């Protein structure tokens, strides 16, 4: 953010965060995520400070924007909660998505069909996307992760403190990352709300899709 008034977090962002439950973490706390939480509720849940969340999201957006080729940014989600959000982020931003199983050796085995050498690496959950995070330590690949209170920070260079468990929170987090990346690039402005609503990134389980239709 840089303390700029233009990059400050608005009331609409806080409304979205509270509606999605992004500020609500887990009952456990990683010792490297202590600087991002605010307090622990009477039911043991740690509250994630949304100032720090916005700061880390803007830092991650800066890191993504610094990658000149958008395709050199890789977005990963093995869990289905963040899969559709990852595809939407890649479509809007231009990054290369890996939704589902991450084949081991994707970054290290040059004699392989699905071999790619990204310049940046973004994952929905360090604990669930541990394979690409481990392989990023073989190819000098910096990593951005959406980290809960209990997320491990090994090989994570920019941890965005957020609830990565709930579908609403994951979708909102990926949507805001895409929106901030686009705003920093120049495409779409920050004077009027973005035309894409956050629910385009939310995961819909089979029960939900059957009920809705």
């Amino acid at each position: 953010s840089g303390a700029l008034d233009v990059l400050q977090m608005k009331e609409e962002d806080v409304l979205k965060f509270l509606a999605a439950g992004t500020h609500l973490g887990g009952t456990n706390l990683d010792f490297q995520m202590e600087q991002y939480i605010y307090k622990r509720k009477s039911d043991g849940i740690y509250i994630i400070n949304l100032k720090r969340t916005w700061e880390k999201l803007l830092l991650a957006a800066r890191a993504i924007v610094a990658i000149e080729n958008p395709a050199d940014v890789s977005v990963i989600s093995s869990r289905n909660t963040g899969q559709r959000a990852v595809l939407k982020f890649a479509a809007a931003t231009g990054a290369t998505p890996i939704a589902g199983r991450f084949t081991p050796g994707t970054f290290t085995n040059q004699i392989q069909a699905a071999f790619r050498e990204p310049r940046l690496l973004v994952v929905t959950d360090p604990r669930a996307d541990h394979q690409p995070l481990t392989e990023a330590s073989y190819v000098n690949l910096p990593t951005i992760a959406l980290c809960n209170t209990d997320s491990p920070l090994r090989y994570v260079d920019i941890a965005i403190p957020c609830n990565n468990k709930g579908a609403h929170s994951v979708g909102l987090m990926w949507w805001m990352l895409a929106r901030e990346v686009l705003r920093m690039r120049g495409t779409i402005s920050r004077e009027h709300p973005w035309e894409v609503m956050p629910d385009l990134y939310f995961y819909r389980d089979p029960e939900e899709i059957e009920k809705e239709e």
């Binding site: 509270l18 509606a19 999605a20 605010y38 509720k41 509250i47 400070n49 609403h168 629910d199 385009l200």
Partner: peptide, 28 residues
């Protein structure tokens, strides 16, 4: 994958908030 609801699920008129997160927002 492109299905989008008429009104955002985050467009709640009322959001239930615990006292501690309200104090955090006050500090926010």
């Amino acid at each position: 994958d492109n299905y989008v609801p008429e009104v955002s699920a985050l467009d709640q008129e009322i959001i239930e908030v615990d006292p501690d997160t309200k104090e955090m927002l006050k500090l926010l």
